[PDB]
Amino acid sequence: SMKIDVVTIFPEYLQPVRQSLPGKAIDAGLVDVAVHDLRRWTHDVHKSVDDSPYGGGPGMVMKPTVWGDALDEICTSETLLVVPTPAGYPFTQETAWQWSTEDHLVIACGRYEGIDQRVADDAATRMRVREVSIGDYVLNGGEAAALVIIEAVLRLVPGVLSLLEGPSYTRPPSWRGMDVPPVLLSGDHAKIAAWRAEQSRQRTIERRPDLLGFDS
Amino acid sequence: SMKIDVVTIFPEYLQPVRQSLPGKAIDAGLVDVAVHDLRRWTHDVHKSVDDSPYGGGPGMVMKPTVWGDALDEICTSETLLVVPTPAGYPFTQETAWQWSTEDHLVIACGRYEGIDQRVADDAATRMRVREVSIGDYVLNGGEAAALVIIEAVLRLVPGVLGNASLLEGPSYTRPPSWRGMDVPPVLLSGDHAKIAAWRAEQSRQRTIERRPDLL
Numbered sequence: 001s002m003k004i005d006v007v008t009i010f011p012e013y014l015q016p017v018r019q020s021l022p023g024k025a026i027d028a029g030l031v032d033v034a035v036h037d038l039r040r041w042t043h044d045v046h047k048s049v050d051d052s053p054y055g056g057g058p059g060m061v062m063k064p065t066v067w068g069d070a071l072d073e074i075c076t077s078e079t080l081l082v083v084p085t086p087a088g089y090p091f092t093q094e095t096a097w098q099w100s101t102e103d104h105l106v107i108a109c110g111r112y113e114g115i116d117q118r119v120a121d122d123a124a125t126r127m128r129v130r131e132v133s134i135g136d137y138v139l140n141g142g143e144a145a146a147l148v149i150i151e152a153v154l155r156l157v158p159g160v161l162s163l164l165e166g167p168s169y170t171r172p173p174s175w176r177g178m179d180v181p182p183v184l185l186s187g188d189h190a191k192i193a194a195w196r197a198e199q200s201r202q203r204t205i206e207r208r209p210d211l212l213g214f215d216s
Numbered sequence: 217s218m219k220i221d222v223v224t225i226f227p228e229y230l231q232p233v234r235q236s237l238p239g240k241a242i243d244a245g246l247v248d249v250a251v252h253d254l255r256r257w258t259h260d261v262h263k264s265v266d267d268s269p270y271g272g273g274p275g276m277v278m279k280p281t282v283w284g285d286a287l288d289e290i291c292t293s294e295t296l297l298v299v300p301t302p303a304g305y306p307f308t309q310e311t312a313w314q315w316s317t318e319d320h321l322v323i324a325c326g327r328y329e330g331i332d333q334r335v336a337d338d339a340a341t342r343m344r345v346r347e348v349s350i351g352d353y354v355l356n357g358g359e360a361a362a363l364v365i366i367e368a369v370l371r372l373v374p375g376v377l378g379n380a381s382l383l384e385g386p387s388y389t390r391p392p393s394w395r396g397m398d399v400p401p402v403l404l405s406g407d408h409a410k411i412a413a414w415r416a417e418q419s420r421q422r423t424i425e426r427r428p429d430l431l
C-alpha cells in the first residue's frame with residue numbers, strides 16, 4: 001500500500017497516470033496517487049511561483065517560500081522526496097526496485113530553470129531527498145519525468161507482481177514473405193533458449209555495448 | 217514545421233501533451249500532433265492487438281498484421297518511425313536535436329514484451345526506423361516514453377513549446393535568507409568573472425558526485 005503525491009504547476013499534465021498500469025494499480029487500491037497544484041500555497045494575487053536568479057543567468061528560478069509551505073503540509077519524516085532534474089543522480093532499474101518498497105513518495109516537479117537549491121537542502125534536514133535524472137536529454141519540466149518514475153516503480157510493487165531482450169514474434173509464421181525464425185517453431189526448449197540468449201548478445205553488443213563493458 | 221503521429225492502445229495518455237501546444241505554434245502551422253487508437257486497425261470483433269509469443273514464455277507480443285496496416289496508412293517514405301523499447305539504442309539530447317528538423321515523426325507505442333520484430337524490419341525497407349530507449353529502466357508500455365520524446369524534441373523546434381560536459385550547479389532566488397540558509401554571497405558580489413568561476417567549480421563538484429561517468 002503506497003501513497004504518491006505529485007506537486008506541480010500543471011496538474012492537468014499528470015492525468016495520464018489514470019491510464020494503463022498506473023490506473024489499474026489505483027483501481028485495485030494498491031496505490032493512491034494525489035496531484036497538487038503548487039499555486040495553492042501562494043499568497044499574492046498573481047500567485048507567483050518564480051523569480052529571477054541571484055548571480056544572473058537566463059530564465060527564472062522557482063521560489064523556495066512556496067515550495068517550503070507545500071512540502072511542510074505534504075511531507076512527513078518518513079517521506080521519500082523525489083526531485084526530477086537534469087542535474088540529478090541517474091534514475092535506474094535499481095532505483096525503481098528500491099522505491100517500490102516505500103510507503104510515501106512525494107514528487108516535486110520543477111519548471112523554468114529549476115527550484116531554489118535551499119528547498120531540497122531544508123527538506124533533507126527532516127526527510128530523505130533524492131534528486132534524479134531519468135536520462136541524458138532535457139525536458140521543459142519535471143512532469144513527464146514524474147510519469148516515467150511512477151510507471152517504472154508501480155509495475156514492481158508486490159501488489160502487481162544486465163542485457164537487452166532480443167526480438168519477439170507471434171502469429172502468423174509467415175508474413176509479407178518474412179518468416180519467424182524456424183527454431184522458435186521447433187518446440188525445442190534448449191535450442192530456443194540458446195538462440196534467444198545469442199540474439200540478446202548480438203543486440204546488446206550492437207545497441208548497448210556499455211552494458212557489456214565496451215566503449216559506446 | 218513538424219507533424220507527429222502517435223499510435224497507441226491508450227490514446228487518452230497523449231491528450232494532455234496536445235493541450236500543451238501553444239495556439240500560436242499551431243496557427244502558424246509549425247506543429248501538429250495527432251494520436252491514433254491502434255484498435256482502429258484490428259481485424260476481429262474482439263479487437264485483438266496481441267498474441268502469444270512464438271517459442272514460448274510469458275507476456276504477449278503485439279500482432280504484425282495490425283501494426284502493419286496502421287503503419288501502412290500513417291507512414292510515408294519521408295517518415296521517421298520511432299519505436300520506444302527498453303531494448304532500443306539510447307535516446308539522447310543529440311538524438312532530440314537530430315529529430316527536431318524532421319518533417320514527419322510517427323511514434324509506435326507498444327507493450328514492453330514488444331511488437332513482432334517483422335513490423336520494424338518490414339518498415340525499414342521503405343522508411344527510416346529508430347528503436348530507442350529513454351533510459352535504463354523498464355516501463356510497461358511505450359506511452360510515457362513517447363511523452364518524453366515528444367517534449368525533448370519539440371522544445372528544440374523554434375517557438376513550439378513556448379520556451380526560450382558538466383551538470384548545472386545550484387540556483388537561488390529571493391529571499392537572500394530562508395530558513396537559516398543564506399544565498400552564497402559571491403552571487404551578490406557584482407564580480408561577474410568570479411561568479412562564473414564559482415559556478416564552474418560548483419558544476420565540477422556536482423558532476424563528480426552525481427555523474428562521474430561524464431568525466
Ligand SMILES: O=c1[nH]c(=O)c2ccccc2o1
Pocket residue numbers: 084085086110111132133134135137138139140141142143145
Ligand atoms: O529527470 C528530469 N529530466 C529533465 O530533463 C528535467 C527538466 C526539468 C525539470 C525536471 C526534469 O527531470
Ligand SMILES: O=c1[nH]c(=O)c2ccccc2o1
Pocket residue numbers: 300301302304326327328329348349350351353354355356357358359361
Ligand atoms: O524507452 C522505453 N523504455 C521502456 O521501458 C519501454 C517499455 C515498453 C515499451 C516502450 C519502452 O520504451
